Amino acid sequence: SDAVEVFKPETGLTPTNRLSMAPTPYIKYDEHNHKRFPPGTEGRPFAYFV
């Protein structure tokens, strides 16, 4: 189904509409409390050992 008839968005180049039509792969999280690992880091987490 079409998103205009189902989600019924507002029209315009708003910040939410830009990510809705084309999401970016360069997602920035907040890093004030936790610094992320490098993306694609594999392996079973060390937190189980802790």
Binding site: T41, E42, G43, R44, P45, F46, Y48, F49
Partner: protein
Amino acid sequence: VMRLSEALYQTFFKRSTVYIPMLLVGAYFSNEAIDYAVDKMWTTRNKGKLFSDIIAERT
């Protein structure tokens, strides 16, 4: 960065029925180590004042 090993994961972590007895033996040894450290520190600090020190002194 630091990451738990896969071969060590498949043995002691994937099933709870293997994880729990390992947890109990680790708990036993942790209690033994804490008991040893506390008792050694207390007996070293208060040497010559306990009753056993007087009894071993009278031998």
